[PDB]
Amino acid sequence: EKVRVRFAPSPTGPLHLGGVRTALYDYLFAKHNGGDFILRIEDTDTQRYVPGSEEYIMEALEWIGMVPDESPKHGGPYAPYRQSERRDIYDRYTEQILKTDYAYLAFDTPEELDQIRAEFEARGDVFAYNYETRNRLRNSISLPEEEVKKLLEEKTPYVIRFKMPLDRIINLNDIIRGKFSVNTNTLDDKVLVKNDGMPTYHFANIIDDHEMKITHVIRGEEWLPSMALHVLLYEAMGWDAPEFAHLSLILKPEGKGKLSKRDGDKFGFPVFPLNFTDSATGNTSAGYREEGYLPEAFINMVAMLGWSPADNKEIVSMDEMIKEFDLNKVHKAGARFSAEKAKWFNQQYLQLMSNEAILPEFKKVLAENNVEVSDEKALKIIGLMKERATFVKDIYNDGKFFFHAPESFDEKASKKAWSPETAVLMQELTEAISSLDFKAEIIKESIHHLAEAKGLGMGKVMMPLRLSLVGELKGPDVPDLMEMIGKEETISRINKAIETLK
Ligand SMILES: N[C@@H](CCC(=O)O)C(=O)O
């Protein structure tokens, strides 16, 4: 039995982190076992359809590097991979289940069901269509066969419901959650086929998991209360159920409850892998991608929300995750999201990149800001800035003094770094460096020689010099800054500082 898993999102909007993590654990489990990773688009509910969802899903999976072996876009041996295109399949299996005792016809109109729901509510009760109520309602169990024929002949709309067994203990086994039991008298007669012949999610999914030879169903815990019904649908069809693994919801950074988009808005962190623009507002929610997260760092971060790399390394690549991943070690306890941790991962991955690997994106940033520098200087600037960077764009945004002279000087910094003797000192410094081979270490030695001839610590020259070149006391070491911007730009900035601050 070749392992086969499917990511089965409905097209109802952008992928949340929980959905990315489910797709990832699908992919890892499949690849770890030499099996197949299927994408099935679960679009049976036409009214909940969100335009652009399916494109977003393909694009996010491609960005992260987990392309489905089978999908609507790519094809595969169980095409069509959109459920809206599988109606003939569901039609034939509907006929099959109606030959059993597990399904029946229900003619109740939505107004009739609204009425009985309101009667229960008024009493403090919740109406369920189940073993206790089905005999007072309008269906093929409660109505004589000749009346059912009459209704059918008149084209009376109906749904198909599952007939829950009476008082039956269903013993279930989940890879994550372990063993537990459900009595069917807690469950209702769920709708399996809507009144247009389209299956509901529950029926379409056991039909398609059976037809697509799925061996392991990995999904979120919101589906756990449905597992008993799904096992009983396999039983009704004469089929063996796959194995199940239910993932606990990602928790808020702080306080009780699940992570939501409202948290990311409220605290300033992205919630979707890629940009997405809401139709109903025109608003665009920026993705991790567009904010500068590397996909390798993003997916490493998502992987850790419930899985501990068996080798104890925090930093792990896609291919090492494939080799290491054990679905049996995925934790049942919920994992808290951490925006700081996501930034930490990006910073860690950025340090592991060579200056050359950063250089293409750095040049794109430089171009967007209308600046140019030689490849050789850009690589040195990347080297000098990358340790303190989280995103490639930080190398420019926090390093603007490499490309732009200061137009003013921070008042606090000026009081600290610039004294009534500083002007004369900086002009002497200009005279010293004007004849140098303008290399960092040579510059540093020349500054040291001026300091010791004047009886000063290094800081007495370096601090006003940094202020002169940067406009505040930020940046990397002054001699390397000077080498990058060059002799002419260095002197020109010392001159402007003298003219401004003496
Ligand atoms: N369409 C369902 C699929 C659940 C499953 O994997 O069975 C969802 O979006 O959650």
Author numbering: 2 to 503
What's the paper's own text on this?
Glutamyl-tRNA synthetase (GluRS) is essential for tRNA aminoacylation and is under investigation as a bacterial drug target. GluRS catalyzes tRNA aminoacylation: the binding of glutamate to tRNA.
EmGluRS was co-crystallized with glutamate, while EaGluRS is an apo structure. ENDScript analyses revealed that despite having <40% sequence similarity, EmGluRS and EaGluRS share significant secondary-structural similarity with other bacterial GluRSs and other aminoacyl-tRNA synthetases, including some that have shown promise as drug targets. The N-terminal tRNA synthetase binding domains of all of these proteins have a sizeable accessible glutamate-binding site that is evident in the surface plot. Intriguingly, the glutamate-binding cavity has been probed to develop promising inhibitors for Pseudomonas aeruginosa GluRS.
